[PDB]
Design a protein around this ligand. Structure first.
Ligand SMILES: [Zn+2]
Ligand SMILES: [Zn+2]
Length: 77
């Protein structure tokens, strides 16, 4: 096998709920148990989608880019 993932912290993890791949725009819970969720940007993508992934993890590797994900904070409970 070619050593060098250079990707996210993908790792097999049971999905009691119907996970939704935010890459190919397809379902996961049903067409098998191929679902790897990243422990950094909570980016879960099919087993094959993993390698396909091109985006650069915001946490894994590089830090927080100029842009900012956080938004207006809540006031009430
Ligand atoms: Zn996918
Ligand atoms: Zn990630």
């Amino acid at each position: 096998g070619s050593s060098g993932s250079s990707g996210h912290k993908f790792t097999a993890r049971f999905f009691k709920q119907p996970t939704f791949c935010s890459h190919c725009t397809d379902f996961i819970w049903g067409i098998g148990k191929q679902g790897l969720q990243c422990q950094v940007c909570s980016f879960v993508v099919h087993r094959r989608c993993h390698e396909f992934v091109t985006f650069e993890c915001p946490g894994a590797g590089k830090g927080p880019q100029t842009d900012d994900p956080r938004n207006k904070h809540k006031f009430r409970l």
